[PDB]
Amino acid sequence: KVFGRCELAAAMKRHGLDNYRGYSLGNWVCAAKFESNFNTQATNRNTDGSTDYGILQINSRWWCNDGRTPGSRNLCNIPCSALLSSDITASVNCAKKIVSDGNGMNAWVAWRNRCKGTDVQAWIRGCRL
Ligand SMILES: C[C@@H](O)CN1CCN(CC(=O)O)CCN(CC(=O)O)CCN(CC(=O)O)CC1
Ligand SMILES: C[C@@H](O)CN1CCN(CC(=O)O)CCN(CC(=O)O)CCN(CC(=O)O)CC1
Ligand SMILES: [Cl-]
Ligand SMILES: [Cl-]
Ligand SMILES: [Cl-]
Ligand SMILES: [Cl-]
Ligand SMILES: [Gd]
């Protein structure tokens, strides 16, 4: 599923991501835009053999199980395919765990390089939230 900007903002807000760990909703929408272009089915292989999945490109090295990242963890206790669903519940609940691990949103490289330090409210501008 490819979400519309405001559609995703509303879904993230409903799942309690807005202001989670101090990160306003625009931060999450911006991250999602550059990580997956709002596409829940996005997948990308990393140089070490792990793969990133879903709207927030969650890594199989530590967070989900994809059966092909030998030696990895599954801290969100979910198959990585659950992160590709049209329903973002799984991606949101797992993202909450990641952003809580100590390094906040810096876990998402695209957020650090393209969202951090910018007008992130612009990402939810115009939406009826
Ligand atoms: C809770 C998260 O921290 C889990 N973590 C996610 C990724 N971490 C992020 C970080 O620790 O900043 C980077 C690597 N991490 C370095 C370290 O922990 O010293 C080793 C593996 N960790 C071991 C552990 O944490 O018990 C498991 C997965
Ligand atoms: C193996 C290293 O991870 C050891 N670690 C070095 C510093 N860590 C780095 C990091 O976790 O990325 C930062 C703080 N760390 C957060 C956490 O771990 O949850 C708390 C204490 N840790 C507990 C543990 O690790 O079991 C002990 C020392
Ligand atoms: Cl695996
Ligand atoms: Cl949803
Ligand atoms: Cl933080
Ligand atoms: Cl915002
Ligand atoms: Gd860690």
Overview of this structure, please?
Disulfide bonds join 6-127, 30-115, 64-80, 76-94. Pfam families: Lys. It is an enzyme of class 3 (hydrolase). The chain is mostly helical. The chain has one domain (1-129): Lysozyme (Orthogonal Bundle), CATH 1.10.530.10. 30% of the residues lie in helices and 6% in strands. It contains four helices and three strands, in the order ααβββαα. The protein has a three-stranded antiparallel beta sheet with strand order 1-2-3. Strand 1 (43-45) and strand 2 (51-53) form a beta hairpin. Helix 1 (5-14) packs across helix 2 (25-36). The chain starts with a helix and ends in a 15-residue tail after the last helix. Bound molecules: ligand DO3 (2 copies), chloride ion (4 copies) and gadolinium atom. The site of one chloride ion has 3 residues, from loops.
Main sheet: strand order: 1-2-3
Instruction: Tell me the span between the first and last alpha carbons.
Output: 21 Å
Bound small molecules, by name, code or SMILES, are: the ligand C[C@@H](O)CN1CCN(CC(=O)O)CCN(CC(=O)O)CCN(CC(=O)O)CC1, chloride ion, gadolinium atom
Instruction: Give the strand tally.
Output: 3
Number of helices: 4
PDB class: hydrolase
Keywords: hydrolase, gadolinium derivative, lysozyme, O-glycosyl hydrolase
Assembly: monomeric
Entry title: Gadolinium derivative of tetragonal Hen Egg-White Lysozyme at 1.7 A resolution
Strand and helix map with partners:
Layout: H1 5-14, H2 25-36, E1 43-45, E2 51-53, E3 58-59, H3 89-99, H4 109-114
Antiparallel strand pairs: 1-2, 2-3
Helix pairs in contact: 1-2
This protein binds the ligand C[C@@H](O)CN1CCN(CC(=O)O)CCN(CC(=O)O)CCN(CC(=O)O)CC1 (2 copies), chloride ion (CL) (4 copies) and gadolinium atom.
The site of one chloride ion (CL) has 3 residues, from loops.
PDB class: hydrolase
Keywords: hydrolase, gadolinium derivative, lysozyme, O-glycosyl hydrolase
Assembly: monomeric
